[PDB]
Amino acid sequence: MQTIKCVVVGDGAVGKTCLLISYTTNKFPSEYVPTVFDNYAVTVMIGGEPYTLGLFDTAGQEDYDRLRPLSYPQTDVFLVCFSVVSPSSFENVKEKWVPEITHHCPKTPFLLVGTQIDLRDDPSTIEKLAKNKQKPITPETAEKLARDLKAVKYVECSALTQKGLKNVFDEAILAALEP
Amino acid sequence: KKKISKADIGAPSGFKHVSHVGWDPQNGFDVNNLDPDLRSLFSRAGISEAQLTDAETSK
Ligand SMILES: Nc1nc2c(ncn2[C@@H]2O[C@H](COP(=O)(O)OP(=O)(O)CP(=O)(O)O)[C@@H](O)[C@H]2O)c(=O)[nH]1
Ligand SMILES: [Mg+2]
Numbered sequence A: 001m002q003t004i005k006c007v008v009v010g011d012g013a014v015g016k017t018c019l020l021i022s023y024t025t026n027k028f029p030s031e032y033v034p035t036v037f038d039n040y041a042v043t044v045m046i047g048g049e050p051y052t053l054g055l056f057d058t059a060g061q062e063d064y065d066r067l068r069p070l071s072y073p074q075t076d077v078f079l080v081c082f083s084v085v086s087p088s089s090f091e092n093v094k095e096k097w098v099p100e101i102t103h104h105c106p107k108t109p110f111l112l113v114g115t116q117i118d119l120r121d122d123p124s125t126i127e128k129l130a131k132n133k134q135k136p137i138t139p140e141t142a143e144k145l146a147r148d149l150k151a152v153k154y155v156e157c158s159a160l161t162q163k164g165l166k167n168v169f170d171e172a173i174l175a176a177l178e179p
Numbered sequence B: 001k002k003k004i005s006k007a008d009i010g011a012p013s014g015f016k017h018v019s020h021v022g023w024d025p026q027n028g029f030d031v032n033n034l035d036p037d038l039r040s041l042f043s044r045a046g047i048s049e050a051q052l053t054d055a056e057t058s059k
Helices: A016-025 A087-097 A123-130 A139-148 A165-176 B036-044
Strands: A003-009 A037-046 A049-057 A077-080 A111-115 A153-156 B016-021
Touching: A003 A165, A016 A037, A016 A049, A016 A111, A016 A165, A037 A165, A037 B036, A049 A165, A077 A165, A087 A139, A111 A139, A111 A165, A139 A153, A153 A165
Parallel strands: A003 A049, A003 A077, A077 A111, A111 A153
Antiparallel strands: A037 A049, A037 B016
């Protein structure tokens, strides 16, 4: 019985909670109050066998720094979900999101999750801030970081529509694990 | 070998609610199934404002 230690890391609003749910529940939630701690275990067919995927949801804040690392010890890979429609995250993503982990485990795999597609496909907002101060991130720009931070791979995902949703977790586990 | 491939990890199917933490600005955390090991780390971490007494144990 093998199990992966997929923990979602990140500080900000990159729809990291809803993407986690729809992934395992294949459905979009409704209630609003999921940012604290939620451990989910999935059963995927890996290597021709029903493997287990240890999903650990963080708080993505500073006030919960006390019970935050609690999900770090038993970890293999890391899910760095950064908002594509927010340069801010991108900047820290390379100098804040991964580093925070490197200080603890600079060898463990690093999944580069790209969330906030629904908005990324909303020129109304993209163009709105595109010339005010903000701007969306291109796959080529995210990739580079995926390599700049020794990230196992760069993959975006959604929840409402599930656009490449699970496809991302498929890259995570694949990374958390090894030959 | 233990090499996973993009085509290996099939489609998920086994949602296991290992732990559920429901915060509330009026009740303050509504955890009713936290993890065993985390149970000690949670009450010791940010949930150390008071031991777990949510409803007395049913005799
Ligand atoms: N349309 C759509 N809405 C989404 C999707 N994912 C999340 N949302 C919505 O965005 C809002 C915030 O989602 P949430 O996952 O809590 O954001 P967060 O990045 O975790 C924010 P925080 O760091 O404060 O906890 C919610 O209203 C949720 O319904 C998605 O794939 N599509
Ligand atoms: Mg959240």
